[PDB]
Write a protein that binds this ligand. Structure first.
Ligand SMILES: *[C@@H]1O[C@H](CO)[C@@H](O)[C@H](O)[C@H]1NC(C)=O
Ligand SMILES: *[C@@H]1O[C@H](CO)[C@@H](O)[C@H](O)[C@H]1NC(C)=O
Ligand SMILES: *[C@@H]1O[C@H](CO)[C@@H](O)[C@H](O)[C@H]1NC(C)=O
Ligand SMILES: *[C@@H]1O[C@H](CO)[C@@H](O)[C@H](O)[C@H]1NC(C)=O
Ligand SMILES: *[C@@H]1O[C@H](CO)[C@@H](O)[C@H](O)[C@H]1NC(C)=O
Ligand SMILES: *[C@@H]1O[C@H](CO)[C@@H](O)[C@H](O)[C@H]1NC(C)=O
Ligand SMILES: *[C@@H]1O[C@H](CO)[C@@H](O)[C@H](O)[C@H]1NC(C)=O
Ligand SMILES: *[C@@H]1O[C@H](CO)[C@@H](O)[C@H](O)[C@H]1NC(C)=O
Ligand SMILES: *[C@@H]1O[C@H](CO)[C@@H](O)[C@H](O)[C@H]1NC(C)=O
Ligand SMILES: *[C@@H]1O[C@H](CO)[C@@H](O)[C@H](O)[C@H]1NC(C)=O
Ligand SMILES: *[C@@H]1O[C@H](CO)[C@@H](O)[C@H](O)[C@H]1NC(C)=O
Lengths: 529, 75, 78
């Protein structure tokens, strides 16, 4: 059940005296001729403020509950008019599943024939109540006429309200941002009002700041066609970075002699590796695995080598150990991703694979990304080796023993480290740029290979040169673009806009008006072109 | 699981001996380097072997070496 | 960015350059980041040098450049 709000829900927006003046104001109001819900008792939403009205004979409605959870979890606002004074409290109240009246608190305050109207809104923590009480002679509807509601209560509570309920017929409407022209009389009261968004005539009255409009044509606001989707297009990907030559390689280098491959001047798709789910380790430093794909670099360096499963932990910033110190050192400010996977069924041999080596001895530790492939005999004692292995002298390298039956810590892992840098260079290594389809003959937003804008895209009859991407008008604005995937030329026509004027005989003749939409196709807005 | 248990002890010997390569000097340094090498040599010798008795012999010697190295680590 | 523009035309002339107007089109654009201060030709040819100048370029119906004015050549061009 719904009723007609007519011109109800208007209240004095402030405490300022004004007389014999038309004042334009913007605030939360009940729209004129809106749909008001008619109740004869559920919990309702509060939204941005609520208009409440009731018709009465014998004081059945007693009060209201405002709050959020309303179940002894959070504070709520309880307003009850019991026999004499109104009692208002804010507490962590426990309410019934169906609250009614018979015949931790932070705030407390104590203050058909009968029509009572109220406005409940909460602004910056202040719960503001406006009200009016008038006599009526009406049973099954709301009266048509104008009145303004006066401020009665202002509670500095700071309480969140999202729902409310009525305590015991009544009507509920909702407030929203609207512009009104309010007419004040000699006695400072409001005698009329115009809802500036109700219709072209009301809009004209507000525009001219008057309740009376003479014969003529007046401009009010503007008409504009809005865009819908966004058309983003880029050139074909064409190629991809040779990551398959790193991760799917048939041979990996020893850790003491790690193999660095330089990747550059290519499209770097990092989504393929990320979502392969074939890696035991995938740890990124300085970059996120889900953002890396959208970053551009000067160089990508892929360092590949084989180590034991237990040694994988050494391939990280701030690490020490046989690998971190003597074979493969990363910096503490390292930027890049460390990826590793189990290769026990590939690199292991029955009896042990001894073709892999690591550095066991070294005079000092390695610098970041430094390599040492020397085979000089290490001197452990004070006696010189003279290049000869023996007592107190060791060959600097030691072999691995990878076999299928090794425990996981001793199983071989293939490790790839992707190190990133950006210099003064253009930075030619970027991930794939995804694109969408092409929409024509509609108002859209767009981005053509970096050229952004808005308008209607249509097929052109133009000629661009083989090296030209877009054209310009005498105004130096863009009037055409080339499609990066299709190589067609499109024209760009700005989405229709123009002023709107209202034609009136004058409000002393008729409230009927005609509306003119300037410089526009009627197909886009009796219709006369 | 015996081979893994022995490898564990050998790993402890090598890792401690590794740290000592940056702490000790003179003869004590030479010894840590020797034991470092030995532990890794045993890792491969253990893989290329059979007979529990030979495996146990490595376990015992490796444990003795680990205890020895701790005498240097605490100095 | 090392930018290369070029044009190839037929001529009938042995000991000079032809007098007439043509425009050179972009062919290559190399994102290198390399410092260049000297160059050499690998095997007659002519070498001139570029400098900041203001030009008025005349475009035709077909989007091509058919003429140009060097705004600093003389009072009339200016
Ligand atoms: C508003 O009420 C009228 C009846 O007066 C009804 O026809 C119309 O559909 C209602 N609008 C909405 C949105 O409920
Ligand atoms: C209304 O309720 C309050 C308690 O909230 C009570 O103190 C007051 O006396 C009641 N009013 C009457 C007339 O009983
Ligand atoms: C009582 O209510 C206040 C609200 O300001 C709250 O901060 C306090 O934690 C509540 N007491 C308990 C025990 O929850
Ligand atoms: C209401 O809740 C929001 C969180 O959703 C909070 O930011 C805001 O400050 C709260 N307002 C009051 C009056 O508690
Ligand atoms: C209210 O307005 C009337 C005129 O409509 C005026 O006569 C009356 O005096 C005003 N009230 C007061 C207190 O002046
Ligand atoms: C490696 O090969 C597998 C199997 O074909 C494939 O799914 C994966 O994407 C490849 N990795 C790279 C970097 O090409
Ligand atoms: C892009 O690929 C499509 C096929 O999906 C092809 O028809 C089109 O010509 C290609 N465009 C370019 C610029 O390569
Ligand atoms: C409307 O026009 C008539 C003349 O035909 C005039 O007598 C009357 O006062 C006018 N009303 C208003 C509000 O101007
Ligand atoms: C209105 O649209 C029709 C159909 O596209 C067109 O023929 C007519 O010229 C348009 N009117 C104006 C003023 O452009
Ligand atoms: C060229 O050398 C200068 C130093 O004289 C330096 O500042 C500049 O960045 C260099 N440019 C390139 C592309 O290397
Ligand atoms: C080039 O210009 C001539 C006029 O000088 C015109 O006739 C010709 O159609 C143009 N070329 C193309 C493809 O339109």
């Amino acid at each position: 059940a719904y009723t007609n709000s007519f011109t109800r829900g208007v209240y004095y927006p402030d405490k300022v005296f004004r007389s014999s003046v038309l004042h334009s104001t913007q605030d939360l109001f009940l729209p004129f001729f809106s749909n008001v819900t008619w109740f004869h008792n559920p919990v309702l939403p509060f939204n941005d403020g609520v208009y409440f009205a009731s018709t009465e004979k014998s004081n059945i409605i007693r009060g209201w509950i405002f709050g959020t959870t309303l179940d002894s979890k959070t504070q709520s606002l309880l307003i009850v008019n019991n026999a004499t004074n109104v009692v208002i409290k804010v507490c962590e109240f426990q309410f019934c599943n169906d609250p009614f009246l018979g015949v931790n608190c932070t705030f407390e305050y104590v203050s058909f024939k009968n029509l009572r109207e109220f406005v409940f809104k909460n602004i910056d923590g202040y719960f503001k109540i406006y009200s009016k009480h008038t006599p009526i002679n009406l049973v099954r509807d709301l009266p048509q006429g104008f009145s303004a509601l006066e401020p009665l209560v202002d509670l500095p509570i700071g309480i969140n309200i999202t729902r409310f309920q009525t305590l015991l017929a009544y009507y509920v409407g909702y407030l929203q941002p609207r512009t009104f022209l309010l007419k004040y009389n000699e006695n400072g009261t409001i005698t009329d009002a115009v809802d500036c968004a109700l219709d072209p005539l009301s809009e004209t009255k507000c525009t001219l700041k008057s309740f009376t409009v003479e014969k003529g044509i007046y401009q009010t606001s503007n008409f504009r066609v809005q865009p819908t989707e966004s058309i983003v297009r880029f050139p074909n990907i064409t190629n991809l970075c040779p990551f398959g030559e790193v991760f799917n390689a048939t041979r990996f280098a020893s850790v003491y002699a790690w193999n660095r491959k330089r990747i550059s001047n290519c499209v770097a798709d990092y989504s393929v590796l990320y979502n392969s789910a074939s890696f035991s380790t995938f740890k990124c430093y300085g970059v996120s695995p889900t953002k890396l794909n959208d970053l551009c670099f000067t160089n990508v360096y892929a360092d590949s080598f084989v180590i034991r499963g237990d040694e994988v932990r050494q391939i990280a910033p701030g690490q020490t150990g046989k690998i971190a110190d003597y074979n493969y050192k990363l910096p503490d400010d390292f930027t890049g991703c460390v990826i590793a996977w189990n290769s026990n069924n590939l690199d292991s041999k029955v009896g042990g694979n001894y073709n892999y080596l690591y550095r066991l001895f070294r005079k000092s530790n390695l610098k970041p990304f430094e390599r040492d492939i020397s085979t000089e005999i290490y001197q452990a004692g004070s006696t010189p080796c003279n290049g000869v292995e023996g007592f107190n002298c060791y060959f600097p390298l030691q072999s691995y023993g990878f076999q299928p039956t090794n425990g996981v810590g001793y199983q071989p892992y293939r490790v790839v480290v992707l190190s990133f840098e950006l210099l003064h260079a253009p930075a030619t290594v970027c991930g794939p740029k995804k694109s969408t389809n092409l929409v024509k003959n509609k108002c859209v937003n767009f981005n053509f290979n970096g050229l952004t804008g808005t308008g209607v895209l249509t097929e052109s009859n133009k000629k661009f040169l083989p090296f030209q991407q877009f054209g310009r008008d005498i105004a130096d604005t863009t009037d055409a673009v080339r499609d990066p995937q299709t190589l067609e030329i499109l024209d760009i026509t700005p989405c229709s806009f123009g002023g709107v004027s209202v034609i009136t005989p004058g409000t002393n003749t008729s409230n009927q008006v005609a509306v003119l939409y300037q410089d526009v196709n009627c197909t886009e807005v009796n219709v006369f072109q | 699981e015996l081979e893994e248990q022995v490898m564990h002890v050998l790993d402890q010997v090598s890792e401690l001996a590794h740290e000592l390569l940056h702490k000790l000097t003179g003869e004590e340094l030479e010894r840590a380097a020797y034991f470092n090498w030995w532990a890794t040599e045993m890792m491969l010798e253990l893989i290329k072997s059979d007979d529990e008795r030979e495996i146990r012999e490595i376990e015992e010697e490796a444990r003795r070496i680990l205890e020895h190295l701790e005498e240097l680590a605490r100095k």
